[PDB]
Design a protein around this ligand. Structure first.
Ligand SMILES: Nc1nc2c(ncn2[C@@H]2O[C@H](COP(=O)(O)OP(=O)(O)OP(=O)(O)O)[C@@H](O)[C@H]2O)c(=O)[nH]1
Ligand SMILES: Nc1nc2c(ncn2[C@@H]2O[C@H](COP(=O)(O)OP(=O)(O)OP(=O)(O)O)[C@@H](O)[C@H]2O)c(=O)[nH]1
Ligand SMILES: Nc1nc2c(ncn2[C@@H]2O[C@H](COP(=O)(O)OP(=O)(O)O)[C@@H](O)[C@H]2O)c(=O)[nH]1
Ligand SMILES: [Mg+2]
Lengths: 49, 431, 136, 430, 431
C-alpha cells in the first residue's frame, strides 16, 4: 500500500495541471474582450470625423 | 518559394488592382514607398536586395488616363516604373480594336514583361487576371493575352476574376456584342473564372453596410477581401491548407464547366456588428443566403455541384463540421445526385485585416465561399436574348466589321454559348 | 514521473528478510496487535492521498461606477422636455440598491454533452447469493 | 455486503435525499470531501453498505438522481455535502414535467428513463450482494409521481426477488399547493400498490404539526422537516449497519409486518422529540420512549391510529438497554389497549435493539406500525378526485398525450377496491 | 438555458416595454449602455461574447413617433439597431387597416427577426406579448402576429398582457368595434390572457399612492412590477419555483376559459409605509380584496375557478399556509363546486426592486395574484352592449368596409362573444 498511495499521488498532481490548462483558457477569452473594448470603439469614431 | 503573378488589364482591372494592392501592402506591413519599417510576403512581393519590395504585378491599358493616375499617386514609387504599360488610342468599347488593330502592337511588350517576371520566380503556382468584360480593351486584350500565354506556358493554371454586366443596370449599349465574344475565347483558355456582376455588390453594400450612395471604390474593396481570403492559405499558417492547384481539382467536374460564382461573410458595419456575437454557426449560414451572393443569380433555381469554404480566424475544426451537417440536412439547398460529398474546407489562423478609411467592420471569423452550380446557366440565357434582339436587325455591326473582324465570327461565338447552355442542361439532370 | 512506478515483476524472487532473527515477536502479541494492523490497512490510503443556511452574494455594480450616459439629442430648455424620456433620468443612489442577491448559477449544468447508454458487453461475473466459495 | 442503493427523483425527493445523506455522513464521520474523520472502529466496519471505494481512498455514495430540470441538481451540487455525488450519476431532462403525470410518465420520462435505468443497472451490477432499493419521491408532483412509478415498475420487472421501499409524501387536504394533486396522486397510488414491496407515507401537515407542538419552535422550515424524515429513514436501516442484541433487516421487517400482499402501507414515527427547554426535566427510559412511541401526535401521518385498529407494529430501539424491560413494556401496552389491537393475531408487536445510539443521545427509537386507520387519506383523496373528475376539469392535458378516461376509471376502481378490502379487516372478527 | 421572448406591438406596448426594460436593467445591474461595470440575466438578455448584453425583445409599430424617441433616448445603446421595426403610415384607429392593407407589408420582416431571435435560444419557455386593444396597430398587427406564430411554432406557450377599454373612461369613439375582433382572434390563439384595463389602475394610485394627477408613466410601472413578480421564479432561486409552463397547466380548467385578472400587493407610499408592519398575514388579504383588482371587475358577483399567487421576499412557507386556510374559512369568498383545492402558491427569496423616481416604497415582501373567476363575463357583456348600440345604425362601418374587410365579419365575432358568454354561464353553475 505504501507504493500504492505513491501511485495515486501522481493522478492528483495530473489533476492540478489539467485545472491550470482550463485557467489559461480563461486567459484566452480575455483576448476578444481586450480587443473589443479599446479598439472596436475607435472604429466607431472613424466615421464621426 | 511559391509565387503568383497578377495581370491587370483595362480600367476595371486597374481600379480593382489599386485597392487589392493597397490591401496587400497594409496586410504585409509594407509602406507605400516600398520600404519595410523596423518571408511570408514572398508570394506577392520580391526583394530588391536591400530595402524596398517590388510587387509581381503588371498594369495594362490603352488610355494613358488611369495609368497616369497611378504614376503620380501615392503609390508612384512602389511599382516597377516600366511595367505600367500605356498606349495612345483607346479601344473605345470596340472588341475588334483591342484584338485585331491596336492590341497587336502592344501585346509584345506585355509578353516580354511576363516572361521576365516568370524567369525570376521559381515555384510559380499560376496567374491571376482581372478584366472588365463588357468593354473593348478589357475583352480584346484579355482574350489575346490568354491565347498567347496558353501556347507560351502550357500547364500553369490561370485564374480569372471577370465582371460581367448586370441583368438590367449597365452603362454601354453595345456590351452584349463583345461579352459573348470574349466568353468564347476565355472558355477554352481559363481554368477558373469567377462572376462579379456589379448590381449584386450594390445591393450587398446597401443591406449590410448601411450605405445609401455606394461608389466603385466601395465595390473594389469587397473584391480585394475575397482575393486576400482566397490566397491567404499560401502565405499564412493554418490547420488545413489549400493551394491554387488544390482548387481546380475539387470544383471542376468537367473541363468545360468551370464558370463559378463567389460569396463572402460576414459583411457588416461596425455600428451594429458589436450587438451580436458572429459565431461560426451563423456566418456559414449567411454565406449560403441567396441575397448575399456576389453575382446577380438565384442558386435556388438549380442544383449545386461543389462548394469550397475557406475559413480564417480562430475557427475550430469540430465546429465547422457541425455546421456543415446542418447545411446538408437543410431542405432548401439541393446538391446533384452524383456528388455525395460536396465540400472542400480550408482553415487559416490569420484574422481578416481592416483598411483605415473603409466601411467594413472587423470580426474574429470570416468565411469566403466559391460554389459551382447549374444556376449559372441563367446569366448566359439572359445575355443571349439581348444579343439575339440586336443581331436580328444587325445594329452596330458595321463598327466591328471595319476594324478587321470577319462577319462570320459573330455567328460562331453565338453557337458555342448555345452548346454551353445545352451542356449545363444535360449535366444538371439526374441519372 | 514516479520512481516507485518503475519497480517490476521478477524482482520478487528472493530478496533479504525484513524481520531479523533476534527480535521475533511472540505469538501472544501478534494475536493481540491485529486491531491496529486492520486499522492501519483500512485507513492508510484515506489519510495519505485522500487529503446550513443560504448566503447572499454581492451586487455586481458599485455605487461609484454607474457611468450615466449623456442623451444623444441636444435639448436646450426644460420646456422641450417630454414625459416619454422621464425613464432613467436619475442615477441610482446608495439607499435603493438591493441589499441581498440570490442569483442562479448554471455552470455545472452547462456541461454534460448528453446522457450515456451502455454500449458494452456484460462483463458481469456472478458473485453467488450464499457464502461465496461455491461460485466460479 | 447486503448493500442497498439509493435513488431519488423530483424536487421533494432530492431535498429529502440531500438531508438523508448529510445525516448518514454525520453518523459515519465523513467530511464533505469524502475523507473519514471518525473515532470508532464500528464506523468503518460496514461502510460499504451505503458507500463505494474510489481512487485515493475516498468514499462516494451510490446514489442515482433523476429529474426533468437542471435547477434542483445544480442547487444540490452547490449545497453542502454535495461534492460526494459522482457527476456520472446525474441524469436529467431539459424541458420539465409540468406537474403532469401523463407528461412525466409517457412523453418525457419514456425517453429519459433509458439512461437512469442504465445507471441503476451498473450500480446494482457492481455491488457484492444486492439487498434492495429505497426511493424518496413525492406523490403530488409531475416528474416524481410519474417517473418514480414507472421506474419502480421496470426495476421490479428486472429484479423480482429484491426488496423495494418507497418513502412517499402524499398531499393533505389542509396544506395543498397544487390544483392537480388528486389526479396524479390517484394515478401514482394505482401503480404503486401493484409494484412496491414496502411503502411509507409522509404528511407535510403532520410534519408542521409535529414541529409546532412537540419541538415548539417558532419558524419551521423544509430543512427541519427533511431532518425529521432523514432521521426516520436512518432508523429503519441502522440495525443493518451496526450490531445489536436483536438485528433485523428490511426483509425480516417486511415478513413480520405484512400479513397479506396488498396491505403494505405503513405509517412511521420517531422518538424522542423534545423542545430545547424541557430536555433536562424529562427522564429518558424505555417507558417514556414507548409513551412517545405510541402517542398519537408523534405520528408522521394525518391518519389517527385510534380511529381504527393496529394490524402489526414494530419498534426499533437504539442504544444500550435490557430486553426484559422492552418486552414487558410491549406486553403491558398490548394487553391493556387490546381494544385498538386486532384479536385474531395475538402478540402482534415486534421489537429490535441496536447497540449504537445517535450522536448526542443516549437512547432513541424509530416506530413503524401497520394500522387500519390509514384509509382516511385514501378516502379523502378519492373524494377530491371524484369531485374534480365528475366535471372533467383539468383533463384535456392528460387526454392529449395518449391517455384516456379508461385509465382514470381503472385507477379509481382499484383504489376503491383497496379501501374496501382494507376496511374489511377493521370489522372482521373470529 | 431558460429563455423568454417579449414582443411589444402598438404604442401602449412600447411604452409599457420601456418601463419593464428599465426595471429589468436596474434589477440585474446592467447599465443603460449595456456594459457591466452568476448567470441570472440569461432569461431576458444574451451575452454577445465580449461585454455588452442585448435584450430578447422586438418592437413593432407603424408610426415613427414613439420608436424614434427610443432610438434617441438614454436606452438607445441597449437594443440591437435592427430589432426596432417601424413603418411609415399609421393605422389611425382602424383595425381593417392593420390587418388587411398595411399590416401585411411588415409581418414578413417581423417574423424573420423573430426566427433569428429564436434560433439563438435553446430552452425557449414562451412568448410575452403586450398590446392595447383600442387601436388599429395594437389590434391589427396583434391578431396577425399571433395567427402566424401559432402555425410557425405551435406548442410554445404564449401569454397576452392585454389592456381593455374601461367601462366608461376611454379616449377613442370606435374602440368598441375593434375590441370584438381582437377577442375573436385571440380566444383561439392565446394560451393565457390578462385583463389590465386602465380605470382600475387609476383608482389604485389615487387611493393608495396619494397621487392626485396620475400620468401614464405611473401606471406602466405597476405592469412592470407584475411582470417581474411573475417571472422572478425563473431567474432567482427560491423554495417553491414555478415555470412559465406552470401557469396554463394549473389555471385553465377548460381550453376555452383562459381569461383572468391580476392583483398586486402591497402598494403603499413611502410617507406612510412605516406605520404598519406589512406582515405576510395581512398583505395576502389585500391581494384578495375585491376592489384592489387590476381589472374593473367585481369578484363578489361570481365564483372562482382557481387562484395562483406568488410571494417574494422573506416569507416563510408555514406562514402562507395559515393565510390560505383563513381565506378558505372566509365565507364571502366562495369557490366553484368541482374545485375542492384551488390555490397554487410559489415562494422566492429575492425581494422586489425599487426604481429611483418611482412611487412605491421599499418593502421586504410582495404578493402577485393571478385568479380565474366567473365574474369576468361582465366586461364581455358591457362591451357587447356597446357594440350592439353602435352597430344598430351601421355607424362607422364604411371605414372598415373600404379597407378590404367584408360586411359579415362583425356577425361572426358577435356570435363568438355570445358563445363565450354561454360557456361562462354554463360552467359557473353547480353540479
Ligand atoms: N467593379 C468595378 N467595375 C468597373 C469599374 N470601372 C468600370 N467598371 C466596369 O467596366 C465596364 C466597362 O469597361 P471600362 O470601364 O470602360 O474599361 P474597359 O473594359 O477596359 O473598356 P475601355 O473603356 O475601352 O477601356 C463597365 O460595365 C463597368 O461595369 C470599377 O471601378 N469597379
Ligand atoms: N396603460 C396604458 N395604456 C395606453 C397607453 N397609451 C395608450 N394606451 C391605451 O391605448 C388605447 C388606444 O390605443 P393606442 O395604443 O393609444 O394606439 P395604437 O395601439 O398605437 O393604435 P394606432 O393609434 O392606430 O397606431 C387608449 O384608449 C389607451 O387607453 C399607455 O401608455 N399606457
Ligand atoms: N418535505 C418537503 N416537501 C417539499 C419540499 N419541497 C416541496 N415539497 C412538497 O412537494 C410538493 C410539490 O412537489 P413537486 O416539487 O412539484 O414534485 P416534482 O414535480 O417531482 O418535482 C409540494 O406540495 C410540497 O409540499 C421540501 O423541501 N421538503
Ligand atoms: Mg397608435
Amino acid at each position: 500500500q505504501t507504493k500504492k498511495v505513491e501511485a495515486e499521488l501522481e493522478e492528483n498532481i495530473l489533476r492540478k495541471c489539467e485545472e491550470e490548462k482550463r485557467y489559461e483558457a480563461e486567459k484566452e477569452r480575455i483576448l476578444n474582450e481586450q480587443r473589443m473594448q479599446g479598439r472596436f470603439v475607435l472604429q466607431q469614431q472613424m466615421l464621426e470625423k | 518559394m511559391r509565387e503568383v503573378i497578377s495581370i491587370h488589364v483595362g480600367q476595371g482591372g486597374i481600379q480593382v488592382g489599386n485597392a487589392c494592392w493597397e490591401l496587400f501592402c497594409l496586410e504585409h506591413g509594407i509602406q507605400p514607398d516600398g520600404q519595410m519599417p523596423s518571408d511570408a510576403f514572398n508570394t506577392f512581393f520580391s526583394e530588391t536586395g536591400a530595402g524596398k519590395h517590388v510587387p509581381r504585378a503588371v498594369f495594362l491599358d490603352l488610355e494613358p488616363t488611369v495609368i497616369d493616375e497611378v504614376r503620380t499617386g501615392t503609390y508612384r514609387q512602389l511599382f516597377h516604373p516600366e511595367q505600367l504599360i500605356s498606349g495612345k488610342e483607346d479601344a473605345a468599347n470596340n472588341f475588334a480594336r483591342g484584338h485585331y488593330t491596336i492590341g497587336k502592337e502592344i501585346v509584345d511588350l506585355c509578353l516580354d514583361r511576363i516572361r521576365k517576371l516568370a524567369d525570376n520566380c521559381t515555384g510559380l503556382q499560376g496567374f491571376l487576371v482581372f478584366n472588365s468584360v463588357g468593354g473593348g480593351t478589357g475583352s480584346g486584350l484579355g482574350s489575346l493575352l490568354l491565347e498567347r500565354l496558353s501556347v507560351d506556358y502550357g500547364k500553369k493554371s490561370k485564374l480569372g476574376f471577370t465582371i460581367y454586366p448586370s441583368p438590367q443596370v449597365s452603362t454601354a449599349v453595345v456590351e452584349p456584342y463583345n461579352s459573348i465574344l470574349s466568353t468564347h475565347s476565355l472558355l477554352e483558355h481559363t481554368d477558373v473564372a469567377v462572376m462579379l456582376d456589379n448590381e449584386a455588390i450594390y445591393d450587398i453594400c446597401r443591406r449590410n453596410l448601411d450605405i445609401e450612395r455606394p461608389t466603385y471604390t466601395n465595390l473594389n474593396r469587397l473584391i480585394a477581401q475575397v482575393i486576400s481570403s482566397l490566397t491567404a492559405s499560401l502565405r499564412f499558417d493554418g490547420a488545413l491548407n489549400v493551394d491554387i492547384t488544390e482548387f481546380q481539382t475539387n470544383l471542376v467536374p468537367y473541363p468545360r464547366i468551370h464558370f463559378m460564382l463567389s460569396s463572402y461573410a460576414p459583411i457588416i458595419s461596425a455600428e451594429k456588428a458589436y450587438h451580436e456575437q458572429l459565431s461560426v454557426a451563423e456566418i456559414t449560414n449567411s454565406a449560403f443566403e441567396p441575397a448575399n451572393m456576389m453575382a446577380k443569380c438565384d442558386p435556388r433555381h438549380g442544383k449545386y455541384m461543389a462548394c469550397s469554404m475557406m475559413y480564417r480566424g480562430d475557427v475550430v475544426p469540430k465546429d465547422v463540421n457541425a455546421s456543415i451537417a446542418t447545411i446538408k440536412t437543410k431542405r432548401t439547398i439541393q446538391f446533384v445526385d452524383w456528388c455525395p460529398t460536396g465540400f472542400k474546407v480550408g482553415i487559416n489562423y490569420q484574422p481578416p485585416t481592416v483598411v483605415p478609411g473603409g466601411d467594413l467592420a472587423k470580426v474574429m471569423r470570416a468565411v469566403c465561399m466559391i460554389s459551382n452550380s447549374t444556376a449559372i446557366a441563367e446569366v448566359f440565357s439572359r445575355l443571349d436574348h439581348k444579343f439575339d434582339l440586336m443581331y436580328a436587325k444587325r445594329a452596330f455591326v458595321h463598327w466591328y466589321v471595319g476594324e478587321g473582324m470577319e462577319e462570320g465570327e459573330f455567328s460562331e461565338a453565338r453557337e458555342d454559348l448555345a452548346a454551353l447552355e445545352k451542356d449545363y442542361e444535360e449535366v444538371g439532370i439526374e441519372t | 514521473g514516479c520512481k516507485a512506478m518503475y519497480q517490476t515483476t521478477n524482482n520478487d524472487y528472493g530478496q533479504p528478510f525484513l524481520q531479523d532473527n533476534k527480535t521475533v515477536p511472540t505469538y501472544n502479541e501478534l494475536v493481540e496487535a491485529q486491531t491496529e494492523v486492520t486499522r492501519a490497512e483500512k485507513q492508510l490510503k484515506n489519510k495519505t492521498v485522500a487529503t446550513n443556511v443560504i448566503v447572499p452574494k454581492k451586487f455586481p455594480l458599485k455605487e461609484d461606477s454607474y457611468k450615466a450616459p449623456e442623451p444623444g439629442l441636444k435639448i436646450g430648455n426644460p420646456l422641450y422636455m417630454t414625459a416619454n424620456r422621464e425613464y432613467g433620468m436619475l442615477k441610482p443612489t446608495a439607499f435603493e440598491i438591493p441589499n441581498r442577491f440570490y442569483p442562479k448559477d448554471n455552470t455545472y449544468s452547462k456541461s454534460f454533452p448528453g446522457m450515456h447508454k451502455f454500449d458494452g458487453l456484460n462483463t458481469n461475473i456472478t458473485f453467488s447469493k450464499v457464502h461465496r466459495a461455491l461460485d466460479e | 455486503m447486503r448493500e442497498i442503493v439509493h435513488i431519488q427523483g423530483g424536487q421533494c425527493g432530492n431535498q429529502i435525499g440531500a438531508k438523508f445523506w448529510e445525516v448518514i455522513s454525520d453518523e459515519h464521520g465523513i467530511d464533505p470531501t469524502g475523507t473519514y474523520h471518525g473515532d470508532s472502529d464500528l464506523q468503518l466496519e460496514r461502510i460499504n453498505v451505503y458507500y463505494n471505494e474510489a481512487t485515493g481512498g475516498r468514499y462516494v455514495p451510490r446514489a442515482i438522481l433523476m429529474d426533468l430540470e437542471p435547477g434542483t441538481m445544480d442547487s444540490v451540487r452547490a449545497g453542502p455535502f454535495g461534492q460526494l455525488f459522482r457527476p456520472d450519476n446525474f441524469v436529467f431532462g431539459q424541458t420539465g414535467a409540468g406537474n403532469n403525470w401523463a407528461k412525466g410518465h409517457y412523453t418525457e420520462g419514456a425517453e429519459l428513463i433509458d439512461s437512469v435505468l442504465d445507471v441503476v443497472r451498473k450500480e446494482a451490477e457492481g455491488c457484492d450482494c444486492l439487498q434492495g432499493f429505497q426511493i424518496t419521491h413525492s406523490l403530488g408532483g409531475g416528474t416524481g409521481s410519474g417517473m418514480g412509478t414507472l421506474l419502480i415498475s421496470k426495476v421490479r420487472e428486472e429484479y423480482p426477488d429484491r426488496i423495494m421501499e418507497t418513502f412517499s409524501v402524499v398531499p393533505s387536504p389542509k396544506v395543498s399547493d397544487t390544483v392537480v394533486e388528486p389526479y396524479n396522486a390517484t394515478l401514482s397510488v394505482h401503480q404503486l400498490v401493484e409494484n412496491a414491496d414496502e411503502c411509507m407515507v409522509i404528511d407535510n401537515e403532520a410534519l408542521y404539526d409535529i414541529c409546532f407542538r412537540t419541538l415548539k419552535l417558532t419558524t419551521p422550515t423544509y430543512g427541519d422537516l427533511n431532518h425529521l424524515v432523514s432521521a426516520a429513514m436512518s432508523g429503519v436501516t441502522c440495525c443493518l449497519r451496526f450490531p445489536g442484541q436483536l438485528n433485523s433487516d428490511l426483509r425480516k421487517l417486511a415478513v413480520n409486518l405484512i400479513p397479506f400482499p396488498r396491505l403494505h402501507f405503513f405509517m412511521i414515527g420517531f422518538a424522542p422529540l423534545t423542545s430545547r427547554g424541557s430536555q433536562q426535566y424529562r427522564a429518558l427510559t424505555v417507558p417514556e420512549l414507548t409513551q412517545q412511541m405510541f402517542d398519537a401526535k408523534n405520528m408522521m401521518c394525518a391518519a389517527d391510529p385510534r380511529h381504527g385498529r393496529y394490524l402489526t407494529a414494530s419498534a426499533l430501539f437504539r442504544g444500550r438497554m435490557s430486553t426484559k424491560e422492552v418486552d414487558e413494556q410491549m406486553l403491558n401496552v398490548q394487553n391493556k389497549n387490546s381494544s385498538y389491537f386486532v384479536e385474531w393475531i395475538p402478540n402482534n408487536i415486534k421489537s429490535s435493539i441496536c447497540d449504537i445510539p445517535p450522536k448526542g443521545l443516549k437512547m432513541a427509537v424509530t416506530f413503524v406500525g401497520n394500522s387500519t386507520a390509514i384509509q382516511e387519506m385514501f378516502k379523502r383523496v378519492a373524494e377530491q378526485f371524484t369531485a374534480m373528475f365528475r366535471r372533467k376539469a383539468f383533463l384535456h392535458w392528460y387526454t392529449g398525450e395518449g391517455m384516456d378516461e379508461m385509465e382514470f376509471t381503472e385507477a379509481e376502481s382499484n383504489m376503491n377496491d383497496l379501501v374496501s378490502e382494507y376496511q374489511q379487516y377493521q370489522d372482521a372478527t373470529a
